[PDB]
């Protein structure tokens, strides 16, 4: 119910030709396991100057029980949101 709101917000900013999401800012990847919501927020917390992810960031805050404010591979945010989007659609079995 509320997750599909998050999903379709991801889908909306993942749209074909718009400029790449948040210039070429890049964040730390995360394992799409458990605690993915809090992890996605903490990796997207330090993105600077990008209003296209603001609704996304506020929405994810409703999915993590605490206030936020593994580093193997750093990925473009456009690819980070694409990765998380496929994981969330899967949990919406």
């Amino acid at each position: 119910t509320a997750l599909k709101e998050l999903i379709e917000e991801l889908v909306n900013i993942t749209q074909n030709q718009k400029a790449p999401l948040c210039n070429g800012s890049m964040v730390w990847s995360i394992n799409l396991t458990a605690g993915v919501y809090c992890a996605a927020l903490e990796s997207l917390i330090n993105v600077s100057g990008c209003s296209a992810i603001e609704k996304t960031q506020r929405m994810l805050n409703g999915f993590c029980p605490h206030k936020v404010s593994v580093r193997d591979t750093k990925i473009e945010v456009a690819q980070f949101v694409k990765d998380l989007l496929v994981h969330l659609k899967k949990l919406f079995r």
Partner: antibody, heavy 122, light 107 residues
Framework: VQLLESGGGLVQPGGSLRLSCAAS????????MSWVRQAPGKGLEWVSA????????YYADSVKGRFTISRDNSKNTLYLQMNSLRAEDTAVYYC????????????????WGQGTTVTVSS | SYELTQPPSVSVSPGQTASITCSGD??????SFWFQQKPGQSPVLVIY???KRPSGIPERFSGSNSGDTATLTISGTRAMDEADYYC?????????FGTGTKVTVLG
């Protein structure tokens, strides 16, 4: 996005009222919803909340056991059944678009309705 | 935390900076929210998640939350900014409001 409160009026102590709040302009069933009241000339006091993720409900200690928050997603309407009303319950009652997700409180409140007036006097 | 304390009154002249405080035990560990209520109308969200401005809110509004104090700053306060401002946070399964600050712009 609009929150249209209704059902206020004058009532004696011990009486009952049922407030309603017609919601529009947003997917109502996905967001938690809250009631916040303001006694004349005083500050804001949160009353109750109904989660948009659970059926869990939350209340301020001044109204627990007396107030019941409810919702109907098909009509996009929020309700507040107020029983055993007291004089200190006199206030303007606002219906507030609350948070998305299970931890809706970390999302926060957003839009507020214009409110209806409830006056409890013997 | 459970008791958010705000100074009752804040007064500035137009163009000056108005700083509104809101103190609470370990308030810096929670998300802080600020609500603006102009006389005769319902409150409007002006700051969420300590520092974010919602859509359509004037850019002179800014917020910070650190330690045990949340601060709302109005840079170059204008006449239309006269309002009651309210602090807010979540604690023990309840929403807790600050006692409120009346911001008077000496016009």
């Amino acid at each position: 996005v609009q929150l249209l409160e209704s059902g206020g009026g004058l009532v004696q102590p011990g009486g009952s009222l049922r407030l309603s709040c017609a919601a529009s302009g947003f997917t109502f069933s996905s967001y938690a919803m809250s009631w916040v009241r303001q006694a004349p000339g005083k500050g804001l006091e949160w009353v109750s909340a109904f989660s948009g993720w659970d059926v869990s409900t939350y209340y301020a200690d001044s109204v627990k056991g007396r107030f019941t928050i409810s919702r109907d997603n098909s009509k996009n309407t929020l309700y507040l059944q107020m029983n055993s009303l007291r004089a200190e319950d006199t206030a303007v009652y606002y219906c507030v678009q609350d948070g998305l997700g299970p931890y809706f409180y970390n999302y926060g409140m957003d839009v507020w309705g214009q409110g209806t007036t409830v006056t409890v006097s013997s | 935390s459970y008791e958010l304390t705000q100074p009752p009154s804040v007064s500035v002249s137009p163009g000056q900076t108005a700083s509104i405080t809101c103190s609470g035990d370990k308030l810096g560990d929670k998300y802080s929210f600020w609500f603006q209520q102009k006389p005769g109308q319902s409150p409007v969200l002006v700051i969420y998640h300590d520092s974010k401005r919602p859509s359509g809110i004037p850019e002179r509004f800014s917020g910070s939350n650190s330690g045990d104090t949340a601060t709302l700053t109005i840079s170059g306060t204008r006449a239309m900014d006269e309002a009651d401002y309210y602090c807010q946070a979540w604690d023990s399964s309840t929403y807790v409001f600050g006692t409120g600050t009346k911001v008077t712009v000496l016009g």
